[PDB]
Ligand binder design. Structure first.
Ligand code: MG
Lengths: 458, 181, 177, 90
């Protein structure tokens, strides 16, 4: 979560919204983005779509925080000749397969395409805590680290900038790769020591220069990275390696298995994920599907040779994807399905057991009421009034109509209407008024999730 | 001095909080449109909640006026309480008529139970009304917030509780005719 | 024990109550606490109820110290535009099975759910004493260490905060490893 | 300005980058850029721009206490040729 305030009686002149971060993997554009001539050169600009570098992405809760608030501007009170100070609580989190024992990364916070708002790099050796795999740095059971708040030069942001922030409600987080030294074994007395003589910065590029990278998102919708010991033909030594197959890879890399002879993942079939390769890997595999006479890779799967420097992106084929390869929003079908289940209907709020994998692609829900004739009366009709869906620690999504109706339950003048509660996927949801001041839910692409009668509730 | 052409604005709170006593509000808007029947008495209906809407524009044609009364009758009070937005759709009509060049009478029906910024903006948006040669009337419902209403209308006088011996209809209609010739 | 006083004839304008500390092990809630979506992920927020981390908890003697005292406020004399300085006597105490011979932990004093009032981390190597098992650091037969009282920046606490303190009469103590 | 180091050889550099000096004309040096040593652990691999094309290009005197001075006569020349020179050590 972040907290924007007017740079130094001020207590409500500050906005504090939550945020949703998620590793990314930005690919290439469509095919028209004017790229400098140095794009079709050797190594020059040829990022091959995606390469080595950690870059997370946050989004600022576009919902409401107060009453009829409107335009952070009037909310805080920022005028052309003013400066806004940013502040936030962030946590480092390891996603790889190895741990870091000391110096954390030097991540830089950016806004837009190049406007850097600051560069966070907490002191080295200052911490002795361990950044273990799948484990947030400041242990989820502790106090999240806070940006410039514990410093002599905060985060400067002028009106024009503070303006952009609102226009997108999203910041970017790029992180280097300088990790602390490494912890190794010691046969002598079987001890785990941190050798000041071996730092990843030395023995890490190799991995990326002699392996196959596969980005899969099964454990969740968060892009997980892993590299397999591929082989390179031009390298004698690197031939001493065991030949690798895409199949075998997905087995050890993430955990795919063969229950009844079908290479699936904890249930999902390998055919439920789209295979996307880079300019290079594309050919290297196409040439194989050629000398193997086949059009479906899922078949000759267990016969694809993975060569070092190969990159592969295995993502669930269900939901749609954006530019950063994130769980955006699936099709109405899958969406509706996840809500087919009901647990408790009330004039206060619906209680469902919506699917996690799905719920993650939903921005919010629009509560309305259809008259027995054909009226479209909507409760929370403002784009910023979608923030309703809650979530009990029991795993059930708890909706509430009251959060946007004078804290009072539904009003059923005629128990024969139709409480229509829609769902809005992220890809569709809006975050700011139209060219005018349309703070309504008029221009939206919601999806029917509920529709019970007045007497079919209570 | 005195005038003859009045423009009555009916800002109505159709929020869930006042979903019970909606009829009273409609009656007050019906018993009032029933009174002033002068061709110069252009009426206008507005209903706010999560967002206000222009039910009846500013005009003196019972053909559409009755039409409005028919719509306000079939209303389901539900949604937040964004009164300011309503009072706004009122001034928008005024300033488009002539601003000061218009003698308007904004009549807002609500519980006065505002929250968060609504109060600040309501009070402000209200002064934006009196800044256009207009008078604000807070005809609250239920145990409304006398306090807020006061800060919303002109003075504690333009605050008449719909419930009473026509105290509202009387005190108001007689306060409006106290400006006529 | 702690000692709250109005940030600098003042002798009785100060409250001094005792305290009861005890290691903790906070588990999960009942089953309704709105937890962010990142709760049903892998490792993410899945604290599994309780994990590795030392977190003690103190409680302030809610009893009396003077006569008909009432509301620490009137007792000390704190008004909206005032600051209250906190101070206390604490002692590190090992509960494990092994001893520590030098650098003690960097424990941080918190108030509420995130309001940190300070972060105590006495100098390293400064002490050669031993933090043996089941044995309070500043030997029970010695002088208990005292927070910001032996420093150039004390413990700031505004009226609103000083208010909360009274509302619960309890602080939290988290310690690193 | 925003500049990026880029290796063209056959071997990589693992730490200290070069001390390149920005010149204008035949000898008028406008500055001498030499970002801190060891400050970076990134690798300057072959045919691969330093600040990875997929990152934020380094920016001259903009992240410093003494910027880049240029008088009217100089600023004039710059326009007359619209070109600067970049020399780099080894
Ligand atoms: Mg209300």
């Amino acid at each position: 979560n972040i907290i924007l305030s007017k740079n130094e009686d001020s207590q409500t002149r500050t906005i504090s919204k939550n945020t949703s971060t998620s590793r990314t993997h930005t690919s290439e554009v469509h095919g028209n983005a004017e790229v400098h001539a140095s794009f079709f050169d050797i190594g020059g600009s040829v990022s091959a779509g995606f390469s080595n570098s950690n870059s997370s992405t946050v989004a600022i809760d576009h919902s409401l925080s107060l009453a009829g608030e409107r335009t952070w501007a009037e909310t805080m009170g920022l005028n052309t000749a003013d400066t806004a100070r940013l502040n936030a609580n962030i946590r480092y989190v390891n996603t790889g397969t190895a741990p870091i024992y000391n110096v954390l990364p030097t991540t830089s916070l950016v806004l837009g395409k190049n406007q850097t708002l600051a560069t966070i790099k907490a002191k080295e050796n200052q911490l002795s805590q361990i950044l273990a795999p799948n484990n947030y740095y400041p242990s989820k059971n502790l106090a999240p680290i806070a940006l410039n708040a514990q410093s002599s030069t905060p985060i400067t942001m002028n009106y024009n900038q503070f303006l952009e922030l609102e226009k997108t409600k999203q910041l970017r987080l790029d992180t280097d790769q300088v990790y602390g030294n490494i912890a190794t074994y010691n046969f002598e007395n079987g001890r785990v020591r941190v050798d000041t003589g071996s730092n990843w910065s030395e023995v890490l590029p190799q991995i990326q220069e002699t392996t196959a990278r596969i980005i899969f998102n099964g454990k969740d919708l968060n892009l997980v990275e892993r590299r397999i010991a591929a082989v390179n033909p031009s390298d004698p030594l690197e031939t001493t390696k065991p030949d690798m197959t895409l199949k075998e890879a997905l087995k050890i890399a993430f955990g795919f298995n063969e229950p009844n002879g079908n290479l699936q993942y904890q249930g999902k079939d390998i055919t439920e994920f789209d295979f996307n390769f880079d300019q290079q890997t594309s050919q290297n595999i196409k040439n194989q599907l050629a000398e193997l006479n086949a059009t479906n890779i899922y078949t000759v799967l267990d016969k694809i040779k993975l060569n070092a420097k190969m990159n592969i992106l295995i993502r669930d084929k269900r939901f749609h994807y954006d530019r950063n390869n994130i769980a955006v929003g699936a099709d109405e079908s899958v969406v509706k399905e996840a809500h087919r289940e009901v647990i408790n209907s009330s004039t206060e709020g619906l209680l469902l057991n919506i699917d996690k994998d799905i719920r993650k692609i939903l921005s919010g829900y629009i509560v309305e009421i259809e008259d027995t004739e054909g009226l479209k009366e909507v409760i929370n009709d403002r784009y910023d009034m979608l923030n309703i869906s809650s979530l009990r620690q029991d795993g059930k999504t708890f909706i509430d109509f009251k959060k946007y109706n004078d804290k009072l339950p539904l009003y059923i003048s005629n128990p024969n209407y139709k409480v229509n509660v829609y769902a809005v996927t992220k890809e569709n949801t809006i975050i700011n008024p139209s060219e005018n001041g349309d703070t309504s839910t008029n221009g939206i692409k919601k999806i029917l999730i509920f529709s019970k009668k007045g007497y079919e509730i209570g | 001095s005195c005038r003859r052409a009045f423009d009555l604005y009916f800002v109505l709170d159709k929020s869930g909080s006042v979903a019970n006593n909606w009829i009273e509000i409609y009656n007050f808007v019906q018993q009032l449109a029933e009174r002033f029947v002068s061709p110069e008495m252009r009426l206008s209906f507005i209903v706010f909640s999560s967002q206000a809407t222009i039910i009846l524009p500013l005009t003196g044609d019972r053909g559409k006026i009755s039409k409005g009364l028919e719509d306000l009758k079939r209303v389901s009070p539900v949604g937040e309480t964004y009164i300011h937005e309503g009072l706004k759709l009122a001034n928008e009509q005024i300033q488009k008529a002539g601003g000061l060049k218009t003698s308007s009478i904004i009549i807002a029906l609500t519980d006065g139970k505002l929250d968060g910024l609504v109060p600040s903006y309501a009070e402000k948006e209200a002064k934006i009304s009196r800044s256009l040669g207009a008078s604000v009337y807070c005809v609250g419902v239920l145990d409304f917030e006398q306090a807020q209403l006061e800060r919303i209308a002109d003075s504690k006088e333009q605050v008449f509780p719909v419930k009473g011996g026509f105290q509202a209809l009387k005190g108001i209609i007689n306060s409006i005719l106290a400006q006529s010739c």
